[PDB]
Swiss-Prot record:
Residues covered by the Peptidase A1 domain: 17-328
Broad class of enzyme this protein falls into: hydrolase
Native organism: Cryphonectria parasitica (Chestnut blight fungus)
Catalytic activity: Hydrolysis of proteins with specificity similar to that of pepsin A, prefers hydrophobic residues at P1 and P1', but does not cleave 14-Ala-|-Leu-15 in the B chain of insulin or Z-Glu-Tyr. Clots milk
UniProt-recorded name of the protein: Endothiapepsin
UniProt keyword annotations, A-Z: Aspartyl protease, Disulfide bond, Hydrolase, Protease, Signal, Zymogen
Family membership: Belongs to the peptidase A1 family.
Residues annotated as the enzyme's active site: 35, 199
GO biological process, one term: proteolysis
Disulfide bonds: 255-290
């Protein structure tokens, strides 16, 4: 089998992407944030504290003839951006772009933190990291991809995120029309539960390529590109007027400035992030100071190839017995 679904930016800045997911019988369609940096599929629901729901579409298990309580199961998660959610668990039928998993753990939120409540466009998350990170207790649950894997034509999914435009998540096949050149594959470590890999270096604009190993994760659930402070400093030094602002919480720059591209290495291959992808707009409405899309990972404890980086590529998440990542230009 295969599946194919369009993913759509939630706002004009590509702060995140939402993909429609069918849950239950009859289908309840929720718009979920596909997140290769976590491993829980959780939803706003009829069980979510009322004061914490503000415009989201909810899953109501009692209206699904295929929903079954996963008795005794609870979940609780905290994300790198400080947000969190928790609740109980049902199993139900979940379909993405034509691909159906029966018995998928659907984690129903009883509580969500403020940032979730405040984002009316995201109805939940669908985790696509390794199932070892899943937070369900006492019995850890499998991701949608893990459950689908054996049925897929090939044990892969692909992320093709758009710049200020929709893109595509495919399951079970590689769309050879969706990228240019070849796909370069690179090794993955699953030891921390992430799609963790090692970039071979970087370049800033037309500058010479610096060969240096940068370990990081391919994370569709993180908006920006977070890299070591040395790398980030080298980038912003090429932007007139750029500075690191402690009050804003990262590098900012005047929008009158032109942003250089940023290149990252995948083996001997190179992915070029255009300058425009690194502009995240005014720090506040009407400000002439713009927020940068490349930021320091110092204090995160890991480098993160988030949407800024991934949307410049066609990305293969290869879930073969030995997982790997593939990157192509597009």
């Amino acid at each position: 089998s295969t599946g194919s679904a369009t993913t759509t930016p939630i706002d004009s800045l590509d702060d995140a992407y939402i993909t429609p997911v069918q849950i239950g019988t009859p289908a309840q369609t929720l718009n979920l944030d596909f997140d290769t940096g976590s491993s829980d599929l959780w939803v706003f629901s009829s069980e979510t504290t009322a004061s914490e729901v503000d415009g989201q579409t909810i899953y109501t298990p009692s209206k699904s003839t295929t929903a079954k309580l996963l008795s005794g199961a609870t979940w609780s998660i905290s994300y790198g951006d400080g947000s969190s959610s928790s609740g109980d668990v049902y199993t139900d039928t979940v379909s993405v772009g034509g691909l159906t998993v029966t018995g998928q753990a659907v984690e129903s939120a009883k509580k969500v933190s403020s940032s979730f409540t405040e984002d009316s466009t995201i109805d939940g998350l669908l985790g696509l990291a390794f199932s070892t990170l899943n937070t369900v207790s006492p019995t850890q649950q499998k991701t949608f991809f893990d459950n689908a894997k054996a049925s897929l034509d090939s044990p892969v999914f692909t992320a093709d995120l758009g710049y200020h435009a929709p893109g595509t998540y495919n399951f079970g096949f590689i769309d050879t029309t969706a990228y240019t050149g070849s796909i370069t594959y690179t090794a993955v470590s699953t030891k921390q539960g992430f799609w963790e890999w090692t970039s071979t270096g970087y370049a800033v604009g037309s500058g010479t390529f610096k060969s240096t190993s940068i370990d990081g994760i391919a994370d569709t659930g993180t908006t920006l590109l977070y890299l070591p402070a040395t790398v980030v400093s080298a980038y912003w030094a090429q932007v007139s007027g750029a500075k690191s602002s402690s009050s804003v919480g990262g590098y900012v720059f005047p929008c009158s400035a032109t942003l250089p591209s940023f290149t990252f290495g995948v083996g001997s291959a190179r992915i070029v992030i255009p300058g425009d992808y690194i502009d995240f707009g005014p720090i506040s409405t009407g400000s002439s100071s713009c927020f940068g899309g490349i930021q320091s990972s110092a204090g995160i404890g890991i480098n993160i190839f988030g949407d800024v980086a991934l949307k410049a590529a066609f990305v293969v998440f290869n879930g073969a017995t030995t997982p790997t990542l593939g990157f192509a230009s597009k």
